[PDB]
Amino acid sequence: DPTLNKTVKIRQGGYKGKIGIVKEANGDRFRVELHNPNKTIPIPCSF
Amino acid sequence: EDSMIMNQSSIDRGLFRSLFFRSYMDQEKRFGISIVEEFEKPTRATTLR
């Protein structure tokens, strides 16, 4: 999947307005790392 | 039993909040006049493991 390793930010949800990067995209579900928190969270592709 | 109960908000106000710093080191190594190590972004096709 070449749509990874790119800057990604959230449009809606509980962490709306946070920058992040994509690491693992097994399928139809995207896991993203965040900058201010030292944590990585899942989220559907569409958000 | 020496278990401490603290003001949450004071920590929200950063009381006793401390820094950390970690310094690393690296350097290119020489295996010989003609053989050294190279600082690069390795591509998979060239380097392995």
Partner: protein
């Protein structure tokens, strides 16, 4: 039944006589104002570049600690509620600070006044940096030296002290009642005597000192309480009082709405 008699009121503080009410209710309302008051503080701190001597996160934290004029925080939505992609002006505010020290000698003391309301859900009187006085630069923010520039762009969002203490609108909120221990709700430690060893409450005047031979009334209950409603400046002690009352009221209304809906 509930009663109010302001002893001393101010922009920052409201000191009043709340009586004819319950101890539990007074504590709950105090909690409501202290923690259950949504407010606006610097949340998303973003550096275009920096040259100062302090950790970027340290500056960001100190920025969040800044009270902001939050009169219309009642009006602007939470960022989470808004459905717009990314933020919009109706769900967040844009400020900016960008300070530089020029000159090989000296030190440019960056001040909160340097923070400026770039945007915000106008005409909401929000996002304005709070200051003791207009001539008051505000809280000292940073010190920039020779060849030390600072450019930053932050985004604040409406939130509650429960979420983070930066949203605490009230700097402090005291409490008491029955300063004479008429209800005997406390046992007074002493070596010779509590009376001659203990000071007297500032509100002691409002209640007579119990008579020597007076027999204890186990029907005595907490009725008259004493209060001062401090605000960190983001809002008025009267506005804080009213808004905390309204928040408690909305919570109760929602609770009863759930009572009827779940049934």
């Amino acid at each position: 039944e509930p009663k109010v008699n302001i002893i001393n009121a101010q922009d920052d503080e409201v000191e009043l006589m709340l009586s004819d009410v319950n101890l539990s209710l007074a504590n709950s309302l105090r909690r409501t104002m202290l923690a259950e008051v949504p407010t606006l503080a610097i949340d998303l701190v973003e550096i275009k570049m920096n040259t100062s001597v302090l950790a970027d996160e340290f500056i960001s934290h100190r920025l969040g600690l800044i009270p902001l004029v939050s009169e219309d925080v009642e009006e602007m939505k939470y960022s989470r509620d808004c459905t717009c992609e990314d933020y919009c002006d109706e769900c967040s505010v844009v400020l900016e600070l960008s300070a530089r020290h020029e000159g090989e000698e000296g030190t440019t003391d960056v001040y909160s006044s340097s923070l400026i309301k770039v945007s915000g859900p106008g005409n909401l009187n929000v996002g304005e940096p709070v200051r003791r006085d207009d001539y008051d630069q505000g809280i000292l923010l940073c010190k920039l030296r020779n060849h030390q520039e600072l450019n930053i762009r932050c985004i604040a969002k409406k939130g509650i002290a429960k979420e983070h203490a930066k949203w605490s609108p009230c700097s402090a909120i005291a409490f008491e009642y029955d300063p004479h221990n008429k209800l005997k709700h406390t046992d007074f430690w002493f070596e010779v005597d509590a009376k001659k060893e203990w000071p007297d409450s500032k509100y002691a005047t409002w209640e007579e000192p119990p008579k020597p031979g007076e027999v204890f009334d186990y029907k005595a209950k907490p009725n008259r309480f004493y209060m001062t409603v401090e605000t960190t400046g983001s809002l008025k002690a009267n506005q804080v009082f009213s808004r905390g009352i309204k928040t408690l009221q909305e919570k109760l209304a929602n609770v009863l709405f759930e009572l009827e809906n779940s049934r």
